[model samples]
Structures are given as C-alpha cells and as structure tokens.
Target: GMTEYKLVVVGACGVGKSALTIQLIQNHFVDEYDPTIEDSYRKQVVIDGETSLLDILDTAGQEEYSAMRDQYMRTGEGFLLVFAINNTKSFEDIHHYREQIKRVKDVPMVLVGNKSDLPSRTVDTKQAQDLARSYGIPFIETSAKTRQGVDDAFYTLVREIRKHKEK
Candidate 1:
C-alpha cells in the first residue's frame, strides 16, 4: 500500500528551498542560480521497502503571493519551514509562515535552518534551536551546499511522523 503525503516546503524566496529539495532527492548540491520565474514546485522521495512518498510543494515568496499561500494551507499535510542561518532577517521572516501553518493546525514539521555552512554572520545555532523550541517544532541546521545534516533533517521529520501515526 503506498502512503502518499503532501509535504509543503514553505519559506521566503532564496532561502534554499530548491537547494534543499535537490539535496534530499538527488543527494547532491546545485550551485545557486537566480530563476526569473517567480516560483517552482516539484515532488520527490521514493522508498522501495516502504509505501511512502514525499510530494513537495514549493511556493513563491513575492509579496503578491501571500493570498496564494492560503490555497496550499488548506491541503498541506505537513510542512518543512525553511530559513537561513547566515541571514538573521530570513530567520525573522519565518515567524509569519510558522504562524500561518499553526493556523492550519496540520501534522508535525521540521524547521530547517539552511545555508548552515556559510560564515556565521547573523543567526547563531542557539538562537535557531531556541526559536524552534519556542514554537514546539523540531529544528536542524543544514548546509545544502555541503550536504550536511540535510538527510538528518528529513529523517527526523519522518521519524516523528511515524511515531505519531503508530499511536
């Protein structure tokens, strides 16, 4: 039996959403490039031993896209809220998405702090961890460029999902 779940990767633009997806699915990193397109969405993840799939939905961060976010919220089964550790501003913007998802009251999530390999310019590890704890979300600092903690972040979410589903 295949268990198909929709996982929305929501965050501000240039927060490494596509990078994280590429790493999680292809197990490799792609150099950053600015896409003229406003947004992009795709699905990934497949396991031969288990009936599971991660259908990822990526949304635009442009100001006009705010209303469009609600459309996805109505159907999102879970979320992977992303932010950049190297940019404190991006970290602050995460609160809005967090609040929006909380409003939807969906299943578990993983708070991803991307660009973790970048030089610590703004946000620190402790701050990121504390913020995640404050929101009661699991957190992981990841470097899509280095492929560090990328797998761990998704696996952590999967484990949490499994635990709750078993009960």
Candidate 2:
C-alpha cells in the first residue's frame, strides 16, 4: 500500500512549469522554440505503485496572478519550485515563491533548476544548493528536454514528506 499525497508545481511563468509537468506526467517535452502560454490546471499522477495526485497550479505569467498563486500555495502538502537554469530572473524569483510558500504552507518543498542541458547558462549548481539550504528545501538541477534529475526531484519531495510525517 502507498500513501496518498498531493504535490504542487509552482514557479514564475515561463520557468518550465508546463514542461516539467508534461515530462513528469506524460513523458513529453515542450519544444524549445515554442511560446508556452497555456492554462493553469491539475495533473494527476500515480507513482511508486500508488495513486498520487499532482495539483499543478499554473500561474499567469503576468503580475496579476500573485493572489491566485498564493491561494493555491495554501492547499498543497509540498511543492516543486521550478526555475530555468538558462534564465537568471527565474532563478532569482524562486526565493519569492519560497517566501510565499512559507507564508501560506509551512511544509517541505523542492527547488528545481530546469533546462540544465542548455550550455549557455550562468546559474551554477552550488548557488542553487546554497539557496535551497537557506530555505531548508532540497535542490536538484533538471532538464525536461533530457528528463535529467526529474524523477529524483519528485521522489525527493515525497521522501521529505514521509520523513516529516514520521516525525
């Protein structure tokens, strides 16, 4: 038997939220050249021989979606705060989402730096790990295009959840 859990995927828009979700749920990747301005919704998944639901809350890319993002932040057991390794702005804004999570849900969260396969990126692994340490969250670099570190990121969150639940 497997315990039921709800996971959330959150980040500033264009930080590969959809790509990450698609890769995790459907094993698909969004084309690198296409613009991703799709709707925000839920993506349910069953993993570890059990049913686990991932309530993927896609926030609007604009400034107006902060409230809705905050609302969704209040409900989930844990989060996957995603960022793009190739985009420093997304990396920087991850802290803001972390703060938001603190305000709404004081629970385990994973820091994901996506697009690791891209060669032209400045955000290094050490800085990401340091930020995760500062927030008390686990960190991993993931590439949706290559599916690198994607499984580790999600399962890490589940491990945290189980660890905390035991405590």
Candidate 3:
C-alpha cells in the first residue's frame, strides 16, 4: 500500500496550474485557458521505491477568496506556488501564499516557475530565489507544453513532504 500525500497547487489561472496538474496526473498537457473552485486529481505511483498516492488539489486564483485558500492549506500536507514567467503579478502574490502557509500551516512548500518556454529565455528570479532561500524551500521551473521539469517539480515537493513528515 502507498502512503497518501495531499499536495495543493496554488497559483493564478493563466499560470497554467491546471495544465501542469493535468500533465503530472494524466501524463498529457491540456493547452487552454481555464477557478474559485477546486477539482482534485489522484495518482498512485512510486518515486525511488517510496510508493505514494498524490492527491493534488487545483485551487482558485487569488486572495479574493483567501478564506477558501486557507481552508485548502490547512488540509494540505504540501503546497506548490505556481507562477508565470512572463506575468509577474501572479508571482508577486506568491509571497502571500508563502506567508499564509507559514502562519496557517507550516508545511513543505515549493515555488514552481511554469512557462519557461515563453519568449524570454531567462527571467529575473533573484528576488524569488532569495525568498526561497530565506524560507528553506525548493524552487523549480516547468513548461507544461514540452513537459519539461514537470515531474521534477512535483517529485521534489513529495520528497519535501516526506522529509518534513519524517521529522
């Protein structure tokens, strides 16, 4: 039997959280624009022999319904802060997620820089890196279109959840 891990994806809609989630859960990307609602997906797999059942929740965009976000956070074992490289607005809100996660529930969190395949080859992440450095969390970039860094992003978070739980 595999252990279950509740990982929540927190990001603005355009950041492609749905696409990334679908790619990770279904092994195929759904290219499109698509929420104050959450529809979770479950996948049972093993990473390095640690069988896991990943219950990933897709959340609504921003602080408009922060109450719901907090509710989602309390139940989640891990959180993935998804952001768009071209759009920094959503990324800026990542700070809020980090703060609330620390305050509401101190759990393993990750910063996912999705859409690395955008026009800009390299985006400034010094600020983000510094924040993650201070918070002691993992930061990764993923492009769901090409399916790049997709697994590593979530796998790293799962490992983080396990690490936190072990302690």
Residue 16 displacement (Å), model 1: 0.6
The per-residue C-alpha lDDT of model 3 at residue 145 equals: 88
Model 2, 1-167: lDDT tens per residue?
44656677878767777777778777878655234454445545556666665555544445534665566657777789999988888888988887766777649889999989999998888999999998788998899889998888887888788777887
| CA deviation > 4 Å runs, candidate 1 | 33-51, 61-69
Q: Across residues 1-167, which tens digit of lDDT does each residue of candidate 3 receive?
A: 67888889877677888889889888887886354456788998788787888989887655544666567678899888988888878778888877766777758888888898888634467766876787789989899988998888899999998898878
Angstrom error of the Cα, residue 39, model 2: value is 5.9
lDDT of 3 at 21: 88
lDDT-superior candidate, 1 or 3: 3
5-88 per-residue lDDT for model 1 (tens digits): 666777777888878877876778977645334343444455445656766666655653366566666677677889988777
lDDT of 2: 0.76
**Ranking of candidates on lDDT, top first:** 3, 2, 1
Better of 1 and 2 by lDDT: 2
- C-alpha RMSD (angstroms) for model 2: 2.8
lDDT of prediction 3: 0.81
Superposed on all Cα atoms, model 3 deviates from the true structure by an RMSD in Å of: 2.2
Task: Give the 10-residue window scoring lowest on summed lDDT in candidate 3.
Answer: 60-69
Residue 46 displacement in candidate 3 (angstroms): 1.8
Ranking by TM-score: 3, 2, 1
Flag regions of model 2 displaced more than 4 Å. 32-51, 61-70
Question: lDDT of all the models against the reference?
Answer: 0.74, 0.76, 0.81
TM-score of each: 0.81, 0.82, 0.87
